[PDB]
Amino acid sequence: IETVPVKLKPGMDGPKVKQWPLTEEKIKALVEICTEMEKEGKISKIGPENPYNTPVFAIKKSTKWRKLVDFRELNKRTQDFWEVQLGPHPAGLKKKKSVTVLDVGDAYFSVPLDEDFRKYTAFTIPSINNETPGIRYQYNVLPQGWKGSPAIFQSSMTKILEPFKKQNPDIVIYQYMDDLYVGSDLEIGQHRTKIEELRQHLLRWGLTTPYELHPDKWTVQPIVLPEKDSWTVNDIQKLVGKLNWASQIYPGIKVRQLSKLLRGTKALTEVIPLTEEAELELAENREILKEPVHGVYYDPSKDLIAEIQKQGQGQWTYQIYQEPFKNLKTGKYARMRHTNDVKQLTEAVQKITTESIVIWGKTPKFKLPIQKETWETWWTEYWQATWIPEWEFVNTPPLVKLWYQ
Amino acid sequence: PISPIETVPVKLKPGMDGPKVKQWPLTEEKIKALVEICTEMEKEGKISKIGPENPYNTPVFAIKTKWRKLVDFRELNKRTQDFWEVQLGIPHPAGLKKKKSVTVLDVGDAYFSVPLDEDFRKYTAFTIPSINNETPGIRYQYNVLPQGWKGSPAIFQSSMTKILEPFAAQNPDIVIYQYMDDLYVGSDLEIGQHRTKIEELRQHLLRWGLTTPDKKHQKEPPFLWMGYELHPDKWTVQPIVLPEKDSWTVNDIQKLVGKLNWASQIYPGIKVRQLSKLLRGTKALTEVIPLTEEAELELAENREILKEPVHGVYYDPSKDLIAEIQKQGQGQWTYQIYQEPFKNLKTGKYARMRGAHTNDVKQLTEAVQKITTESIVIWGKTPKFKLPIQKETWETWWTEYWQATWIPEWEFVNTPPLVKLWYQLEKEPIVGAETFYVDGAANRETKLGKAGYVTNKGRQKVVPLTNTTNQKTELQAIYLALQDSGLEVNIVTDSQYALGIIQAQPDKSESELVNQIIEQLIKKEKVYLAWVPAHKGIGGNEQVDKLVSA
Ligand SMILES: C=CC(=O)N(C)CCOc1cc(Cl)ccc1Oc1cccc2cc(C#N)ccc12
Ligand SMILES: [Mg+2]
Numbered sequence: 005i006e007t008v009p010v011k012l013k014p015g016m017d018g019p020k021v022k023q024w025p026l027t028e029e030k031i032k033a034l035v036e037i038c039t040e041m042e043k044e045g046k047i048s049k050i051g052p053e054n055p056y057n058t059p060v061f062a063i064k065k066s067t068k069w070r071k072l073v074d075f076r077e078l079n080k081r082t083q084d085f086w087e088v089q090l091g092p093h094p095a096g097l098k099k100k101k102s103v104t105v106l107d108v109g110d111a112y113f114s115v116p117l118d119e120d121f122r123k124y125t126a127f128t129i130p131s132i133n134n135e136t137p138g139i140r141y142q143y144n145v146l147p148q149g150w151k152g153s154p155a156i157f158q159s160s161m162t163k164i165l166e167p168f169k170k171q172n173p174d175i176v177i178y179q180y181m182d183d184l185y186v187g188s189d190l191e192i193g194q195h196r197t198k199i200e201e202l203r204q205h206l207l208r209w210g211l212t213t214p215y216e217l218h219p220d221k222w223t224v225q226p227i228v229l230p231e232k233d234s235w236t237v238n239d240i241q242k243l244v245g246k247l248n249w250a251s252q253i254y255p256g257i258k259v260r261q262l263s264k265l266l267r268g269t270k271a272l273t274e275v276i277p278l279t280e281e282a283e284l285e286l287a288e289n290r291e292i293l294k295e296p297v298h299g300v301y302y303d304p305s306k307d308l309i310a311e312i313q314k315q316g317q318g319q320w321t322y323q324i325y326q327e328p329f330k331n332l333k334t335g336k337y338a339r340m341r342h343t344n345d346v347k348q349l350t351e352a353v354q355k356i357t358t359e360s361i362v363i364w365g366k367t368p369k370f371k372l373p374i375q376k377e378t379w380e381t382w383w384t385e386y387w388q389a390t391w392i393p394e395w396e397f398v399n400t401p402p403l404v405k406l407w408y409q
Numbered sequence: 410p411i412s413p414i415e416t417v418p419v420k421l422k423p424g425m426d427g428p429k430v431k432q433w434p435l436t437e438e439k440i441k442a443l444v445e446i447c448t449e450m451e452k453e454g455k456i457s458k459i460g461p462e463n464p465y466n467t468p469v470f471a472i473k474t475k476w477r478k479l480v481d482f483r484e485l486n487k488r489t490q491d492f493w494e495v496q497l498g499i500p501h502p503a504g505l506k507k508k509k510s511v512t513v514l515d516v517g518d519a520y521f522s523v524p525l526d527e528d529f530r531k532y533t534a535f536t537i538p539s540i541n542n543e544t545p546g547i548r549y550q551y552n553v554l555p556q557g558w559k560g561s562p563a564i565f566q567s568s569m570t571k572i573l574e575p576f577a578a579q580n581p582d583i584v585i586y587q588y589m590d591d592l593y594v595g596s597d598l599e600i601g602q603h604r605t606k607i608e609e610l611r612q613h614l615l616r617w618g619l620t621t622p623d624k625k626h627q628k629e630p631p632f633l634w635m636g637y638e639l640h641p642d643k644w645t646v647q648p649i650v651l652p653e654k655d656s657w658t659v660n661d662i663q664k665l666v667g668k669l670n671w672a673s674q675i676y677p678g679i680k681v682r683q684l685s686k687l688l689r690g691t692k693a694l695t696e697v698i699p700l701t702e703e704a705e706l707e708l709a710e711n712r713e714i715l716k717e718p719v720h721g722v723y724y725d726p727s728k729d730l731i732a733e734i735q736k737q738g739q740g741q742w743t744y745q746i747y748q749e750p751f752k753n754l755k756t757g758k759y760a761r762m763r764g765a766h767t768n769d770v771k772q773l774t775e776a777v778q779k780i781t782t783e784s785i786v787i788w789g790k791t792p793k794f795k796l797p798i799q800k801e802t803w804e805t806w807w808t809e810y811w812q813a814t815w816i817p818e819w820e821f822v823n824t825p826p827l828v829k830l831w832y833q834l835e836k837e838p839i840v841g842a843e844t845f846y847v848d849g850a851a852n853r854e855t856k857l858g859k860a861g862y863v864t865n866k867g868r869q870k871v872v873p874l875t876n877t878t879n880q881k882t883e884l885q886a887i888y889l890a891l892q893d894s895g896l897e898v899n900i901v902t903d904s905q906y907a908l909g910i911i912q913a914q915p916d917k918s919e920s921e922l923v924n925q926i927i928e929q930l931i932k933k934e935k936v937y938l939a940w941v942p943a944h945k946g947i948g949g950n951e952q953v954d955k956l957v958s959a
C-alpha cells in the first residue's frame with residue numbers, strides 16, 4: 005500500500021527512446037492487452053506534458069500474445085538505485101545438476117510505484133502510417149523488466165521463500181529480473197517435485213506462475229585439430245595456421261616440425277607424408293589443447309562480451325570474454341531443423357544469455373553477425389525471454405570462423 | 410471561441426524562471442495596430458490585461474491587407490519543459506484506404522481556441538509600447554495557447570483528440586485523421602448523409618469552441634497537401650522542376666538530389682547515385698562542384714523520365730501487397746509496390762553500397778530489407794516479393810554467407826537482367842593447376858613497392874609499383890598471379906586484408922584494382938585462394954617474401 009521512493013542517478017533525465025513501428029497484428033494485440041491493464045489499474049493514459057518514452061513489443065512466450073517493454077534505457081538511468089541502493093549472485097548455482105527457471109514477474113503488479121517516478125515509465129502504442137498519434141500510457145504498479153521491480157519486491161520475496169529454504173537448505177534460489185533460478189543436486193524426478201512444491205507454495209501465497217537447465221554439462225570447448233589419413237600441402241598449411249592462431253592462447257604449441265614438411269615451393273594438392281617428428285609434435289599439440297588457459301578470471305566491474313559465428317548447417321559458435329583472447333567460456337549451439345538463420349541466431353542469443361545469467365549474474369554485450377535493420381525487424385518473432393541484452397552488429401566478416409569450428 | 414476543455418499542466422525546466430526580454434520600441438502605426446488587435450483579443454477572452462506585478466516579458470511586433478500580431482517566444486521556449494514530440498512523420502498517400510467520400514476541415518484559430526494552464530499564464534506576459542515611453546505600456550497575458558510557443562502543437566493535438574472521442578464513439582463508420590490544425594474525414598455513406606455526418610461533427614466541434622469551414626466553403630479535390638496531389642481515385646506528387654545551371658554549388662546539388670528523391674516515390678527509375686557522389690566533398694554550401702560525366706548522364710536520364718506523368722493508387726486492405734524489384738546497373742536498384750498488376754501504390758529506389766565492395770545478391774537482400782521496413786511503416790504488413798533471382802542462386806549465397814539473413818517468401822520472376830553469381834571460388838585446392846605463392850610490399854615512407862610470385866613450376870616474377878600501400882600491393886600480387894596463370898590457379902597469400910576482400914566474393918567495387926581482379930576471376934574457370942601466416946617459413950610463402958623483399 006505504501007510506495008518506495010525512487011530516484012534517477014544524479015543529473016540524469018528519463019528515457020526518450022523511439023517506438024519502433026509494428027505490424028497491424030502486433031498493434032491490435034498491444035491495444036487489447038493495454039485496454040485490460042487499464043481496467044485493472046496497472047497503467048493509465050497520459051498527456052502531452054510527459055515527454056518520456058520506452059519502446060514496447062508484442063511477443064509470445066504460447067498462443068497468447070504478451071507485451072514486452074524494452075526498459076534497457078530506463079535501467080541504465082536508475083542503475084545506482086537497483087545495483088547499489090538495492091540488490092546478490094551465488095557462485096554455486098552453476099554447479100547444480102538441475103536448474104529450473106520460474107517466471108514470477110506477475111508478482112510485481114501487486115505493488116504500487118512511486119507516484120513521482122511513474123512518468124518515467126511512459127510508453128507508446130504506435131499507429132499505422134502515422135494516421136493517429138500513438139496511444140500513450142504510464143505505469144501505476146511495478147513493471148516487468150524494470151530493474152527496480154525485483155529490488156523493491158525483494159523483501160516480500162524473501163518472506164515468501166523463507167519457509168521453503170528452511171525445509172530444503174541444499175536447494176539454491178537466485179533471482180534475476182522476472183525469473184527465479186532454482187538449482188538442486190537431486191535426481192530429476194525429485195527435482196521436478198521439489199519445483200512443484202515451490203510453485204504451490206508460491207501460488208497459495210498469491211504469486212501466479214506459468215524450462216530446465218543442466219550447468220553440470222557446460223564447459224569451455226577445447227580446440228580440436230583434424231585427423232586425416234593423407235595430408236596435402238593445403239591441409240598442413242591450414243593446420244599450421246590454426247596452431248599459429250592457438251598459440252596466442254596456449255604457449256607450448258610448436259610448428260617447427262610441421263612446417264619443415266613444406267620447405268620448398270610445392271603444389272597445394274601434393275600429398276605430404278607426416279614424418280615421425282612432425283607427427284609427434286602434432287600429437288604433443290593435441291595434449292596441450294586438452295588443458296584450459298591459466299590466468300583467466302571474471303572481473304565483476306568489466307562488461308561481458310559475446311561473439312557469435314555462423315558455421316553453416318545450423319551450427320553457431322560463441323565465445324564470452326572481457327578482454328581479447330581471454331575467453332571465460334566458449335560453446336557451439338546446434339539446431340535440429342523448418343528453421344532459418346534469424347530463428348537460430350535469436351535462439352542462440354537467449355541460450356548464451358541464460359548461461360551468462362546463471363554463471364555470473366549479468367548479461368553480456370553481444371556482437372551479432374547480422375545486418376542491424378534485419379535484426380531490428382525480426383528479433384521479436386522468436387524472442388521468448390523477458391529480458392533484453394545489449395547488442396551491436398559486427399559487419400566485418402570473421403575469417404576466424406574456421407578456427408572456432 | 411475558447412474551450413471548456415481541461416488544461417494540460419505546464420512547468421518550466423527546473424531551476425529556470427520566466428523570460429524578461431525587453432520590448433524594442435515600435436512605430437506609432439504598428440503601436441495602433443496592436444492596440445486594436447489586443448482589444449479584439451481581450452474581448453474574446455484570448456488575452457487579459459495584467460497588473461504591474463508580473464515581472465516577465467516577451468517582445469511583440471506587427472506586420473502586414475490585414476495587420477497580424479507576432480510574438481517572439483524564443484526565450485520562453487528555451488525555458489519551458491519538453492513535451493511529447495508531436496507527430497514528425499506524415500501519412501503516406503499510398504497507405505490511405507480508398508474511401509467513397511472525403512472531407513477536409515480546417516480548424517480556424519486553432520491554438521487560440523484552447524485554454525492555457527492557469528499557473529503558466531504569468532510567463533506569457535507581453536507589453537504594447539507607449540509612444541516615446543511617455544507613460545507606461547499596456548501589460549497583457551495569454552489565456553489560450555499562444556502561436557509560436559513550444560507547447561501549442563502538442564497540447565492542441567491532445568485537446569483535439571479528447572474532443573473528438575465522444576463523437577467518434579457514437580459514429581464507428583466515420584474515419585477521422587488529424588494533422589496539424591486539419592481533420593480529414595472519410596466515410597462510405599451516401600454523399601448526402603456523409604454531408605450530414607460532417608454537419609454534425611462541425612456542430613460538435615463548434616460546441617467545444619472549434620470553428621470549422623462552412624460546407625460549400627471547404628476545400629475540394631484535388632488537394633495540394635504536403636507536396637502531393639490527392640485525387641479521389643489516385644495520387645501523385647506535385648510537379649518537380651530541376652534547374653538548368655552552368656555551375657553547381659554544394660547547396661545546388663543537395664536541392665537536386667532532394668527533389669529527385671521525392672520524385673522516386675512514384676516515378677520509377679530515378680537515379681541519384683552519381684549525383685550524390687559529388688557531395689562527398691561536404692564543404693561550404695557555396696563550393697562549386699564540377700559535374701561528372703556519369704553525373705551528367707544520370708541527371709539527363711532523370712529529366713527524360715520526369716517528362717511523362719505518373720500516379721499512384723490508394724490502399725485496399727482486402728487485396729494482397731506485392732513488391733517487385735529490378736536491377737538498374739552500377740549498383741542501383743528500383744522497385745514497385747502494388748496490389749493490382751499495373752496500379753502501383755508507390756515506387757522507390759535503393760543504391761547504397763554500405764562498404765567499399767559488394768555484390769548483387771547482397772544488394773538485392775538489402776533492397777528487400779528496405780522494402781520490408783517501409784511496408785510495415787506504411788501498411789502494417791510485409792509484402793510478397795517478386796524477384797529476378799532463382800532459388801538456387803540465392804540459396805547458395807545465403808548458405809555460404811557468414812552473416813545471418815532473412816529470406817521472405819518470394820517467387821522467381823524471369824525478367825532480365827537476372828541476379829547471378831558471376832563467379833565462385835573453389836572450396837578445395839585444384840589438382841594439376843599451377844600453385845602461385847604471391848606477396849607484395851611497399852615502403853611506408855617512399856610509397857614505392859613491388860608485387861611478385863614464385864610458383865611450383867619454377868616461375869618467378871616481380872613487378873615494380875609506384876605510390877602504393879602495403880595493402881594495395883597485396884591485392885596487386887593476387888592480380889599478377891591471375892594475369893599470368895592458366896584457366897585454373899591455386900593462389901597462396903599471407904595477407905588477411907586481401908583474403909577477406911576476395912573471400913567476400915564481390916562483383917563490384919570502388920577500387921580500380923579490385924574491379925580488375927573481378928574481371929580476371931570471371932574469366933577463370935577455377936580459382937582456389939589460400940592463406941598462410943606470414944614470416945613463419947612455410948615454403949612457397951617464404952620464397953616470395955625473400956624475393957619481394959630484396
Ligand atoms: C481524396 C481522395 C482520397 O484521399 N481517398 C479517396 C482515400 C484516402 O483518403 C482518406 C481516407 C480516410 Cl479513411 C480518411 C481521410 C482521407 O483523406 C486524407 C487522408 C490523409 C490526408 C489528407 C489530406 C488532405 C488535404 N489537403 C485531404 C485528405 C486526406
Ligand atoms: Mg513506446
Ligand SMILES: [Mg+2]
Nearest residue numbers: 761762763764
Ligand atoms: Mg553507402
Ligand SMILES: [Mg+2]
Nearest residue numbers: 848903943954
Ligand atoms: Mg608478406
